[PDB]
Symmetry: D2
Subunit: 311 residues, 4 copies
C-alpha cells in the first residue's frame, strides 16, 4: 500500500490544524482543497516544511480542483457557510450535494467525515448524494463535546483528562444529551466521587451547562473553536486508518437504535479498517430517551428546512 491520501474539503482554520496534526502523526499525504484561489497552496507549503521538524514524510498539497478527490482514502468535509442560522441550511445543502457528486465520481470507496454544521443534518445529506455505504460516513460530534465534559471533570478531580470517560449523544449542538449516569473516572462510576464529596451534583450541573455552551463561551472570549474540533476529527480518522477499533461517539445512520431509523444521530461506534464496524446502542432509560428524542426531532426540523429555498 502507498500512504493514505487524506483530502480536506475546506482549508479554513480547522483544516489548517488537521493538516498540522496529520504531518505530526505521519498519517498520510494531505490535500488542502478549497474554493478560495491559492490560499490552500499557501497553507500547504507552510505545513509541508514541518515534515523536517516532525521526522515525517507526508506530502501536503493545495488544490482548487474537485477532481483531486480521485483516490482519496479519507475525505474530511469542513466546507460551508457559517455567517438567522437556519437560513444557511439550504445553501449548505447545495454544498453537500456538490461535494457528494464529486465523491461518487472520484472516490466512492473513501471514508468520509462531515463537520459542516448542523452536522447531524449535513452528514445525512452527504450520505444520500455521495452514495457511500452507511459504514463509510460519519459526522463529528461526541468526541468533541465529550472532550469538554471529560476535561472539565478531570480538572476538578485532579486526574489525567483521558481517565474521565463520558457519553454525549443524540446530536451535536444545543440539544446534545449529556448522560450523567455514563460518566466514569478511571473506570469508576462518577457517583462514587459524588458520594465522597469530591465533586458535587451542583458542580456537575455547572459543568454540564458549560459543556453545552463551550463554543459560545470561546466566541464570547473573542476566539473561536477550531483546535479541539481538529484534534477530535483526527482521532476519528486515525482510528480508521490504523484499524485501532476505538469506541468513539459519532453521528451515524440509525437503523432502529433508540427507536429511531432513517436519520443520523450521535452514538458510540467502533471505528476501524472497515469504517463503522459496530454501532453501540446505550441502554437508555425513559428520561434519557426522551432527551434523545428531542435531539432527533431538532435534526429533522432542520433537515426539512435544508431542502429548498423560498422567495
Amino acid at each position: 500500500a502507498p500512504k493514505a491520501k487524506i483530502v480536506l474539503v475546506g482549508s479554513g482554520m480547522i483544516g489548517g490544524v488537521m493538516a498540522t496534526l496529520i504531518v505530526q502523526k505521519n498519517l498520510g499525504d494531505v490535500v488542502l482543497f478549497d474554493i478560495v484561489k491559492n490560499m490552500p497552496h499557501g497553507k500547504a507549503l507552510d505545513t509541508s516544511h514541518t515534515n523536517v521538524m516532525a521526522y515525517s514524510n507526508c506530502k501536503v498539497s493545495g488544490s482548487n480542483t474537485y477532481d483531486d478527490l480521485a483516490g482519496a482514502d479519507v475525505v474530511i468535509v469542513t466546507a460551508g457557510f457559517t455567517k438567522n442560522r437556519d437560513d444557511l441550511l439550504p445553501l449548505n445543502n447545495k454544498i453537500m450535494i456538490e461535494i457528494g457528486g464529486h465523491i461518487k465520481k472520484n472516490c466512492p470507496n473513501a471514508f468520509i467525515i462531515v463537520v459542516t454544521n448542523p452536522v447531524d443534518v449535513m452528514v445525512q445529506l452527504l450520505h444520500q448524494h455521495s452514495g457511500v455505504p452507511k459504514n463509510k460516513i460519519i459526522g463529528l460530534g461526541g468526541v468533541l463535546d465529550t472532550s469538554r465534559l471529560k476535561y472539565y471533570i478531570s480538572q476538578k478531580l485532579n486526574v489525567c483528562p483521558r481517565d474521565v470517560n463520558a457519553h454525549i449523544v443524540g446530536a451535536h449542538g444545543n440539544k446534545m444529551v449529556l448522560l450523567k449516569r455514563y460518566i466514569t473516572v478511571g473506570g469508576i462510576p462518577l457517583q462514587e466521587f459524588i458520594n465522597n464529596k469530591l465533586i458535587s451534583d451542583a458542580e456537575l450541573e455547572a459543568i454540564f451547562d458549560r459543556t453545552v455552551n463551550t463554543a459560545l463561551e470561546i466566541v464570547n472570549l473573542h476566539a473561536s473553536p477550531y483546535v479541539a474540533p481538529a484534534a477530535a476529527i483526527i482521532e476519528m480518522a486515525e482510528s480508521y486508518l490504523k484499524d485501532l477499533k476505538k469506541v468513539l461517539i459519532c453521528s451515524t445512520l440509525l437503523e432502529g437504535q433508540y427507536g429511531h431509523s432513517d436519520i443520523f444521530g450521535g452514538t458510540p461506534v467502533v471505528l476501524g479498517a472497515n469504517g463503522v464496524e459496530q454501532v453501540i446502542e446505550l441502554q437508555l432509560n425513559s428520561e434519557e430517551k426522551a432527551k434523545f428524542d428531542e435531539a432527533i426531532a431538532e435534526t429533522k426540523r432542520m433537515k426539512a428546512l435544508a431542502h429548498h429555498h423560498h422567495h
Copy 2:
C-alpha cells in the same frame, strides 16, 4: 532540572525491557544495577545504542555499586530470589532490608516502585526499611493484572484494548480480586454487552480464570512474563515523572480503606509529581469486601513468614 535519574535495582529480564522502553520514551538517564558482575554494563551498552534509532538522549549505565543510588529520582526494584515458594520470603526480606538502607542513605527523596514477589509484602518491608513517606512508594500489581483482563475482553469484543477498563484489587497474585461490576467498554458498563449477548457470563468466567492464571499459562508455554510487567511499571513511572495524574491500580499503604490499616494492598491511586496524590477507595459491596479481606489475609500470612529464618 537535569533529566530524571532512574535506577533499576535488578538488571534481569524485566530490567532489560524497562531500560529499552525508557530510552524509547526518552524518560530519563538509566542505571542498570545488579549484584552480578559486568552483566549490567553489557546490557547497558547494548541499550545505549538505541538512542540513535529512537532520537533520544538518555544515558544508560551499568552498576555493581549500591552508592550509584545517589540522586535517583525513581528507583525500581526487581531484585530477589524466585527459585516451596514461602521459603524464599525471609531471603527476600533480607534483600529489601539491604536495598532500603541504601535508599535511606543515598536517595531518600526517590519515588520507589517494588516488583519483587510477593509484591504486597515486599513493598511494605521496603517502605519500613527505606524510611520514605507513604506517598513515595508503591508496588506493581493492578496495572499488570488488569492489562490481561482488559486485553482478553477487548479481543472478544473487537475493540481497542485500552477502551476496556477494569479493576483488580487487594493483592497481586492468586488472591487478586477481579471486580466484574467495575468493567466498562468505551466507558459503558460491561453488563450492557452481556445483555446484548455480545459476551456471555460464562465467557467472562473463563477470562477471569485466564487472568488469574496468566503467569502460569506463559510459563507452561516455555516462556516467562517480563514484557508486560516492564510496560506496566514504565506506565506507572512515567505518570510520576511527567505529572500525568493517571488513575492506576497499585499496591499502596492502606489507612482504613476497605476496613484495613497497617498493610499494603492493591487499589486505584492517582500518580503524579507528588507521588501517590490520591488513594481511591472503591465502594465495594460485602461480597467484594470478603474477597478483599482474603487477599489481605494472605499478604499478612506471608509477611509473618518473611521476618525470620528457622533451623
Copy 3:
C-alpha cells in the same frame, strides 16, 4: 520537579500552533499571554480540551497580566508590530524593553526564545533589557530557514525530509547565508548527488532562491507562515526542556566567531538543560565569510534604527 511552565508572550497565530504542539507533546503547562483582552483565554480554553485526544495533562491558561511570567521556565516572544518596515523598529524596541523588564523581575532564570522580527536585532535588545545570561536567550532563524531548504531538496531527491541536513547562517531574513558546501543527504555530501546528475546546480540555485523567498511566496498565495515557525520554535524549546542536546541553528550572542563580537547572529548551537551549551563556529571560507559579514552589517543597520523615534 513540577512540570515546566511555558509562557507564550503573544497569542497570535504562531502562539496558537505552539500551544497545540506543546499539548500534543505533553511538554509543560502553557500560558497564552497577550495584551488583547480575553482572546488568549478563548484560545487557551479551546486548546485545553485537546489534552483528552492527546492523552496529555498540560494546563493551558490565558493571561492579560505580565506578572504571570512568574516562575516561567521557558518564555517565547512573538509579540510585536508587523504592519516602510524599518519604521516599526523603534516600536518593537519598546516592546522588547517592556517584556525584558518583566522577565528580569518575574523569571530571571527562564530560557528565552525571541521570534519578533527582525529577530537578530530583537533578540539582542531583549537580552540587554532582560539581564539574562548569554546562554539563556536565543532567536528563531536557522531551524526555520533550513527546514525549507532541506524539505525542497528532499522532494527532489525522493528521500525522507529530515535526512537532508543544511546550514543557513548569519541572519534570519533576506541576507541569510545559504551554505551549499554544508548540505548533505543521508550524511553524504550533496556534491556526490550533483556529480551523479540526480540534482543539478541550476536546480539548487532555484531552490536557494525559493528558500530565501518562502515567506513572500506564502503571503503571495494569500496565506501566511505560522505553522512551520511554530514547529521550529517547539523543536528548540523541547531540546532545552528534555536536555536532548540537538545541534540547531539559532541566533546567539557572538563572542569572536566569524570575526564578530557584540552582536547576535545565526550559527549552529547545542541546546540542552544548560541552555546554549555550545556555540559551533563553522570553518567558513572567505567567500562565505563575506556573505556572513553582509548579514551582520544589515542586523547592525536595523539595530541602530531601533533605538529612537524621530519627529
Copy 4:
C-alpha cells in the same frame, strides 16, 4: 488496507524485542514463528498485553507452522545456528533454503529483512531461494554498526546521538569499512571538530576499534547484543511500512556499484513503499575501495563454504 502482517521467523531474544517495539509503535500484527514448540505462543501472549499500556491494537500471535507466512507484508529472519564459526555456514544455508521455499510459496510479495549471520552471505542465499525481486530483500548491517559509531562520538562531543551521522559499508562483521571521511556532527564535517581539538584523531581510532568490536565487548561483559539489533531492524521495517524513504545502510544486491556485481554488500539505500527505492553508491577513493574489496572478498569466501557439507 488492513494492518500490515509482520512475521518474525525466529522468536529468540531479538524477536522478542522486535515484537515489543512493533506494538509500542503500533506498526502491524505480529507473528512470532519458531521451530521451538510453544515458546513463541508464550512470548506472544506476554507481548500482547502491552497493547493496553501502549494504546495500540496489534495482534501478537505465536506460530510453529511455516504456512502462517501466508499474506505476510514483512518477514524478518533471525533463525539460525550461532553455536569454528565457518562450520555453521552450510547448516545455516539449509535454514535459508527452507525459509526461502516457504516465502516463495506463501508470501512472494513480502519485503524480507535477513539478520542471520553472516548476514551478507545469508541474505543472498535467501534472495536466491525465495525468488523475491532485488528491491524486496535486504540484510541488517549498517544501521546497527553505525548506531554504535554515532553513539560513541555523540557522547564524546556532548550532542544528541542522532545528530552524528556516519557510514560503515561493505559487510556487517569484522571486515566492516568505517569511513572517517563521511562522519558529520549536526551536518558539519567531523574534521572541523578535530581541527578545533574537540575530538582527536587518536580518540577516533579508539572509537573505530570499539565499534568493530562492540558485539565482542558486550559478550565479554556477560551480556549479548539484542536490543540495538532489534531497534535497527525495526527502523528499517518502519521505513518500508510507512514509506518514510529514509537513507539507511543495509546489505543489498550490488549491480556494479564499487566495481562489484552478483554479491550483496552494505551501502546506503532509500527504503520506502517500493522496498529498496534507490541504491546510493558513495564516491569512495582508492584507499576506501580497497577496504570495500576486502569486505566483499570475505563475504565470497564464506558464501563458497555455505553450499556444501564435507565428510
